[PDB]
Design a protein around this ligand. Structure first.
Ligand SMILES: N#Cc1cc(Cl)cc(Oc2cc(OCc3n[nH]c4ccccc34)ccc2Cl)c1
Lengths: 404, 558
């Protein structure tokens, strides 16, 4: 007996366009839906269904098997009241504290549960043809679709049951469910951890359900880093007071006066200048200041999370997560046969998964790329069962350095 | 005509809305007559059914004559019903491109006759399609009718017909995997590799299967012969091309003549390599009236001419062999103009095309080249389902240098350099470090938001100093002007410190062309230099030479 889904009032189904797919991914998808149709998970549909969600074919992490990935970002937004303020899955602040967190796929739990007949249409998607030889193959789900945030919201009750024994027997293990995945944290020895996971997999196995090791607690800083040196130049000071200046506003109490007076008159850039010790007091206070958190910055659940990424060079990328510009909740660095897109994709997922662990919600990405490039390529490297939201930006010449 | 035995597509009105109820204008006797003649026939053939006055709905009906002829056509204004009908799925979201067609032994085109009228309409929706043939003026209540088939002009016909034709073909497609059927509107394009025998035969098993489902098609002798004049193309059995392009010789060109011109050209551009259209296009800028004659600029005169030559002689394209690769070649035509050719076998093009677009206000060839590669990549996936191998007029060394240092992620799929000038390069590089024994120019610029008056100048560490007044500027303009001065009064090597992230960002990107003349002069200056270093400092921070030009250019201004 299905639970009923109602769209967020005065708004209706997603009518999202479908990206051109390559022959290889189109065939991979046809085979899949052919089988899903048989299993009765989805059903072909008539023109009288105006909706659409894009569908892609990914390969996963170190996998030879094609996997289907439906982009329910739009459908998600239009149902936010259901899966959030009505059938929400509480996020445990304990998770981020665990020595080890393992990620398991659980999306297969949904095809055993039926979808509200009246909501089915909203899950329509298309398998495109090539050179428009023919009409795409239209489908709609009959069961909880993977990728749709309503799925784990509904399955919540069944999941709670599936896990009751395990949890009862390991009160110090944290299990969080974010969409298709299960996050299991423990402070156990790796071997005892790996063991409990396999033990947890068995429970899962008795209900049908059939890891990837994260180590949150060892997720540390990345303070703005000021250079230490012998023999300074007008330039280096200039760079220093500029970087230190920008470090302010976000960092509380950054002083630059001292460093500034050394730059008096109009001198050459190459010209070397002796650092007055008080200046060092500043570098000291600033360095010390920079090596700490922010103070005053807290996460507000009613606010979207934002992630900026900067291409530094040589396989290195920097990133910051905040809700209010300059009020950084977290910042770090992802370091790499990898190309710019492959690498950037890998950062997006890395950051996202941490966000899911820390705040139990994904950031909206500001990607330093061409909307078009990203769009054609991102799928060749996507491995996640979810997709974060993203806009495209032109990185600010300075921000990149101030963060290196 | 048969009316397909097939299943019906449930149709619904838009939520919170009711069927239409529009009043019928009264028509002349000659028209009421025609409609009565037309309608009885339709009713006879089952197309429409007579109903009573208990049906509250109504659409207006009308009857037109025959331009030249003496027949009457009945027009049903389905505007209000369409506005009340649910939205349907988008029919076809693209159309087959010839160059994506694979060569087939034999192909027969099959147009379904009376398409919409050969397919039924949801029993419970038929009611909203009610219309009335008014009585002779006011007396007598009209003659009410309603549809049993897909009406012409109605929102859902194209969608429901296609669906039906899809459902009607599925069966056949199973027992005929080797057969290609192109569904386009109410046409069917059939091609197989069997000998004429099993073909002229298989086509028959098709037409027949079509008929058990109420669908009639043309039989041989009536089936069209190659070359197919389809969609502006010419479909020969071994090649393809756009239909004959006729470039109108003229005395005076009006806005509307150039417009049509540009279009014939652009269409021609899909197989005729080297078609340029920027000069012809510039004229249209701001354009007076449709009938306003525009004097052909001499570059435009020169473009039109070069185009005429390209068009002199016919060019054709080949078809797609799925086993060979795809090779994409790009060339720089100049003024942000690119041209590409796509072939599988060296110089036997499947198709050509061009890229112009000005992505950004300041750009360079490296940025443009990769924008065209992406535009082409997409194009390929669309037509062939796979991306081509590229041959670009850019040195692998240039590419590396640029991609490596650029702030933005960039990625060209498989490529190979091909020496086909002009070759793509970088016209200048900014040093990473300050130039020893080079004049440090501390530039700056200010502008009064009220008077629009500006001031741009610089103070060097070598004693030099300058300030220039600008009349209708902005801060951005003054700050770029300041850098221009420094580049003018400085010689082969300089160090430049500004507090303009805006100017910085603009230059740091190695632009080689801009919509701004200023930016263009700067570029010209940057290319002249032997080495330039450009740094940024915050403003209103007591930074050395900085705080010095500020007072200089702030005087009067602010
Ligand atoms: N009108 C139309 C019209 C419009 C479209 Cl989009 C397609 C069509 O049928 C074909 C064309 C093909 O490509 C080239 C070709 N192979 N063999 C041929 C014989 C004669 C002419 C062209 C060809 C290959 C297969 C088919 Cl199904 C006919």
């Amino acid at each position: 007996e299905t639970v009923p889904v109602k769209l967020k009032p005065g708004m209706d189904g997603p009518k999202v366009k479908q990206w051109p797919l390559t022959e290889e991914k189109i065939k991979a998808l046809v085979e899949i839906c052919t089988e899903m149709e048989k299993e009765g998970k989805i059903s072909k549909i008539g023109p009288e269904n105006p909706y659409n969600t894009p569908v892609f074919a990914i390969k996963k992490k170190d996998s030879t098997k094609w996997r289907k990935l439906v982009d329910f970002r739009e459908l998600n937004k239009r149902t936010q009241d259901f899966w959030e303020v009505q059938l929400g899955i509480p996020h445990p602040a304990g998770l981020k504290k665990k020595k080890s967190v393992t990620v398991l796929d659980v999306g297969d739990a949904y095809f055993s549960v039926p979808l509200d007949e009246d909501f089915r249409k909203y899950t329509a998607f298309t398998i495109p043809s090539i050179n428009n030889e023919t009409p795409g193959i239209r489908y709609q789900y009959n069961v909880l679709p993977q990728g749709w945030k309503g799925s784990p919201a509904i399955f919540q009750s069944s999941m709670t049951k599936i896990l009751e024994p395990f949890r009862k027997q390991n009160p110090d293990i944290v299990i969080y469910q974010y969409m298709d995945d299960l996050y299991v944290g423990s402070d156990l020895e790796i071997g005892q951890h790996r063991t409990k996971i396999e033990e947890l997999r068995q429970h899962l196995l008795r209900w049908g359900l059939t890891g990837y090791e994260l180590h949150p607690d060892k997720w540390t800083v990345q303070p703005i880093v000021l250079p230490e040196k012998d023999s300074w130049t007008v330039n280096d000071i200039q760079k220093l007071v500029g970087k230190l200046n920008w470090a302010s506003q976000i960092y509380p109490g950054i002083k630059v006066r001292q460093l500034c007076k050394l730059l008096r008159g109009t001198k050459a850039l190459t010209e070397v200048i002796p650092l007055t010790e008080e200046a060092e007091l500043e570098l000291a206070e600033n360095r010390e200041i920079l090596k700490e958190p922010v103070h005053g910055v807290y996460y507000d659940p009613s606010k979207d999370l934002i992630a900026e990424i900067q291409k530094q060079g040589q396989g290195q990328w920097t990133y910051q997560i905040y809700q209010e510009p300059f009020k950084n909740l977290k910042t770090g660095k992802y370091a790499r046969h990898t190309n710019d897109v492959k690498q950037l994709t890998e950062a997006v997922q890395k950051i996202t998964t941490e966000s899911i662990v820390i705040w139990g919600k994904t950031p909206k990405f500001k990607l330093p790329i061409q909307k078009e490039t990203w769009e054609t390529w991102w799928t060749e490297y996507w491995q996640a069962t979810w997709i974060p939201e993203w806009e495209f930006v032109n990185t600010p010449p300075l921000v990149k350095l101030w963060y290196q | 005509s048969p009316i397909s035995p097939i299943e019906t597509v449930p149709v619904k009105l838009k939520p919170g809305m009711d069927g239409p109820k529009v009043k019928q204008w009264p028509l002349t006797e000659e028209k009421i007559k025609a409609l009565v003649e037309i309608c009885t026939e339709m009713e006879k053939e089952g197309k429409i059914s007579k109903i009573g006055p208990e049906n509250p709905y109504n659409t207006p009906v009308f009857a037109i004559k025959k331009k030249d002829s003496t027949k009457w056509r009945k027009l049903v204004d389905f505007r209000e019903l369409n506005k009340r009908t649910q939205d349907f799925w988008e029919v076809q979201l693209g159309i087959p491109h010839p160059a994506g067609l694979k060569k087939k032994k034999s192909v027969t085109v099959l147009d379904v006759g009376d398409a919409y009228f050969s397919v039924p309409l949801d029993e419970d929706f038929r009611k909203y399609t009610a219309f009335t043939i008014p009585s002779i003026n006011n007396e007598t209540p009209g003659i009410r009718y309603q549809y049993n088939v897909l009406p012409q002009g109605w929102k859902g016909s194209p969608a429901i017909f296609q669906s039906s034709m899809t459902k009607i073909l599925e069966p056949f497609r199973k027992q005929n995997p080797d057969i290609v059927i192109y569904q386009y509107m109410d046409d069917l394009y059939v091609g197989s590799d069997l000998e004429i025998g099993q073909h002229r035969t298989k086509i028959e098993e098709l037409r027949q299967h079509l008929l058990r489902w109420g669908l009639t098609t043309p039989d041989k002798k009536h089936q069209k012969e190659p070359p197919f004049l389809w969609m502006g193309y010419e479909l020969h059995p071994d090649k393809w091309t756009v239909q004959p392009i006729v470039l109108p010789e003229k005395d005076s060109w009006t806005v509307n003549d150039i417009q049509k011109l540009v279009g014939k050209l652009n269409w021609a551009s899909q197989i005729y390599p080297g078609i340029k259209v920027r000069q012809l296009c510039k004229l249209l800028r701001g354009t007076k009236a449709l009938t306003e004659v525009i004097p052909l600029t001499e570059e435009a005169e020169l473009e039109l001419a070069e185009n005429r030559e390209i068009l002199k002689e016919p060019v054709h394209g080949v078809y797609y062999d799925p086993s060979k690769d795809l090779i994409a070649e790009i060339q720089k035509q100049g003024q942000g103009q690119w041209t590409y050719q796509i072939y599988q076998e060296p110089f036997k093009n499947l198709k050509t095309g061009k890229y112009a677009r000005m992505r950004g206000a300041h750009t360079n060839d490296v940025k443009q080249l990769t924008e065209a590669v992406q535009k082409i990549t997409t194009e390929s996936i669309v037509i062939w389902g796979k991306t081509p191998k590229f041959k670009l007029p850019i040195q692998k060394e240039t590419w590396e240098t640029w991609w490596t240092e650029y702030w933005q992620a960039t990625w060209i799929p498989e490529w190979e350099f091909v020496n086909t000038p002009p070759l793509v390069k970088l016209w200048y590089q900014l040093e990473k470090e300050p130039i020893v024994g080079a004049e440090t120019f501390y530039v700056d610029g200010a502008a009064n938001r009220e008077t629009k008056l500006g001031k741009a100048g610089y103070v060097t560490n070598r004693g030099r100093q300058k300030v220039v007044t600008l009349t209708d500027t902005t801060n951005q303009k003054t700050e770029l002007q300041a850098i221009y001065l420094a580049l003018q009064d400085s010689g082969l090597e300089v160090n430049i410190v500004t507090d303009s992230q805006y100017a910085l960002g603009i230059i740091q990107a190695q632009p080689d062309q801009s919509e701004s003349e200023l930016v263009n002069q700067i570029i010209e200056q940057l290319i002249k230099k032997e080495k330039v270093y450009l740094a940024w400092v915050p403003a209103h921070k007591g930074i050395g030479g900085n705080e010095q030009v500020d007072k200089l250019v702030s005087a009067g201004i602010r």
